[PDB]
Ligand SMILES: NC(=O)c1ccc[n+]([C@@H]2O[C@H](COP(=O)([O-])OP(=O)(O)OC[C@H]3O[C@@H](n4cnc5c(N)ncnc54)[C@H](O)[C@@H]3O)[C@@H](O)[C@H]2O)c1
Ligand SMILES: NC(=O)c1ccc[n+]([C@@H]2O[C@H](COP(=O)([O-])OP(=O)(O)OC[C@H]3O[C@@H](n4cnc5c(N)ncnc54)[C@H](O)[C@@H]3O)[C@@H](O)[C@H]2O)c1
């Protein structure tokens with residue numbers, strides 16, 4: 061039966077007179093640092109010599125190299141890409157982590173691969189948010205939060221749990237709920253969402269677009285209906301709240317509801333369910349782990365090629381034309397990560 | 401080449417001294433009425449004797465039966481279920497529509513089936529929002545809007561276009577963009593989104609859940625990842641702005657981006673593409689229209705059974721357990737349709 065912490069199950073008392081080193085200032089790193097600072101937690105950023113170092117400085121943080129940040133920290137949050145954990149842990153973190161210090165990862169992958177390991181007299185934990193940085197930041201400023209999974213991997217102090225949930229409360233995850241889940245299960249779940257579900261959702265959107273265009277439909281209109289209007293995104297996000305079938309029952313015309321229920325449960329052949337199983341096998345069996353280590357060569361050169369190639373896919377060409385001709389409701393993001 | 405109207409291409413001048421009758425006060429009707437009123441447009445609500453009649457009165461509208469609303473209107477917006485258009489048009493609208501008055505539908509279906517037809521001396525148009533009511537209302541209050549398609553079917557007055565785009569501006573669609581598209585194409589596009597894409601997206605999420613749970617994954621965790629956390633919804637909504645592949649390039653860890661690009665373009669067998677074509681054939685060929693007419697029997701008895709059955713699917717059982725255990729960042733939808741500006 062599930063262990064789920066909300067605000068009444070956590071306090072910031074464990075962070076009194078303690079310094080948190082946020083290692084990295086990327087998607088997660090920047091949100092953690094901003095939210096920790098605004099919660100009145102003593103925070104510093106450890107970063108290599110790149111644009112993220114300069115960004116952290118521009119946003120008013122105390123920024124040093126990783127080793128110096130760790131040496132002056134009671135809690136260390138390793139929020140850099142997972143493939144870089146091994147080298148940074150061995151060289152920068154392990155030699156500099158004080159007696160009784162807590163190390164946290166936001167993904168179980170480095171723990172699964174043994175790249176991050178328990179150290180004598182130190183604590184090791186996972187606090188893995190179920191959301192990217194901008195929403196974590198916007199939710200936090202609105203007195204809300206995103207969910208997270210946590211796992212106490214090594215508790216040598218006997219205070220690891222209090223300190224992890226104090227970080228979770230400070231960054232706002234306990235406003236949603238922080239559930240106990242093994243780092244191994246989090247890794248496979250998380251990679252499954254990225255490798256099966258996200259690609260398949262976009263593949264299906266893209267399939268809808270290309271079929272409509274092949275059948276002589278206005279390409280701007282095709283793009284808007286399949287996602288460009290924000291309607292399908294809105295359905296899915298409202299669905300997260302009240303249920304996906306429920307959203308259609310609440311917000312769909314009777315015409316829409318009859319159409320939806322005609323094909324609901326009938327659209328996908330068994331081959332999709334089998335592909336999902338295949339993706340899980342690759343994740344659980346080390347095939348993906350090997351693939352990711354290869355792809356991280358030449359600083360993710362192959363990924364840079366894939367990102368640039370995707371921009372010329374018909375869906376993405378059609379998107380650029382639609383977004384040039386239709387204004388989308390956005391929010392000003394200027395100074396979003398500056399002190400509140 | 402596409403004809404797209406934004407604020408600078410429309411004005412409220414055509415609505416000066418004119419009354420709009422909003423027929424229905426449902427998902428679309430309530431948002432149209434709220435936004436029109438807030439934009440300074442004289443609005444009447446026409447409705448049968450049901451809860452929507454009472455809600456419209458409670459929210460401070462002038463509410464009568466449909467015939468009386470039409471009789472006292474310059475512009476009539478028929479915002480009731482599409483299968484009800486034919487009878488309401490024949491009995492309530494056609495006999496009571498003033499000379500030079502405009503009738504608007506928000507879906508091309510009744511126009512395709514011949515249930516709504518041009519009337520001598522009157523205008524007929526489609527203004528079809530690409531969004532449901534609550535977002536249309538929320539966007540409006542933020543100085544934003546949702547896109548729409550429009551079509552001028554009949555233009556006796558020679559001012560049908562001016563008046564339709566005036567409505568579109570008052571309800572906020574011109575803040576996004578209002579594109580010219582034929583009612584027939586709008587019908588087929590709209591039904592395709594509802595019958596292929598929406599079912600397929602939820603089937604995909606449900607398959608994700610089923611496979612994780614069947615292999616011993618925590619059901620709450622499985623539910624949260626496939627949509628319950630709001631992450632996939634946020635990805636698709638941010639994707640609407642900057643692009644779906646671009647959201648991953650911007651917001652995904654390198655671990656995430658390498659995983660995504662490994663299977664992107666490779667997840668679906670050819671059978672999914674073929675089913676999309678089949679759904680489009682059923683829509684274009686009259687089969688769905690016949691199915692919808694049959695389904696609208698006993699006031700949508702089958703739909704009521706399907707809605708209640710869907711509550712008992714494992715995904716929806718898991719959803720209720722997750723939502724009791726995790727607090728979701730919602731917006732107080734209470735007060736949404738209260739008078740503004
Ligand atoms: N729901 C959407 O988001 C959406 C999107 C764009 C287009 N549309 C179109 O807008 C129109 C209205 O759809 P909706 O989703 O708002 O519907 P809805 O189910 O919310 O409509 C309910 C309203 O219709 C009235 N009504 C129901 N049956 C009636 C009957 N037999 N006679 C008279 N009035 C009756 C009710 O009294 C109530 O006012 C349709 O043409 C639909 O295709 C809907
Ligand atoms: N991105 C998300 O939304 C998300 C969600 C939950 C969990 N996570 C986890 O959070 C962690 C950070 O992911 P992210 O998406 O924020 O990453 P990111 O790509 O945004 O990380 C960029 C940051 O990492 C640093 N960095 C990059 N390569 C480095 C190297 N070789 N050595 C040292 N520092 C290096 C950069 O200087 C910068 O500060 C990962 O473990 C990831 O799995 C990410």
Ligand SMILES: CC(C)N(O)[C@@H](O)C(=O)O
Pocket residue numbers: 291311312313315316317530531532590594
């Ligand atoms: C909410 C749906 C998907 N709308 O786009 C309308 O077309 C409808 O028929 O309900």
Ligand SMILES: CC(C)N(O)[C@@H](O)C(=O)O
Pocket residue numbers: 190191192250254631651652653655656
């Ligand atoms: C944004 C994604 C989908 N996150 O959920 C993270 O797990 C990641 O690895 O990026």
Ligand SMILES: [Mg+2]
Pocket residue numbers: 167250251254653655656
């Ligand atoms: Mg991840």
Ligand SMILES: [Mg+2]
Pocket residue numbers: 189190191250253
């Ligand atoms: Mg994730």
Ligand SMILES: [Mg+2]
Pocket residue numbers: 313315316507590591594
């Ligand atoms: Mg529709």
Ligand SMILES: [Mg+2]
Pocket residue numbers: 529530531590593
């Ligand atoms: Mg629609």
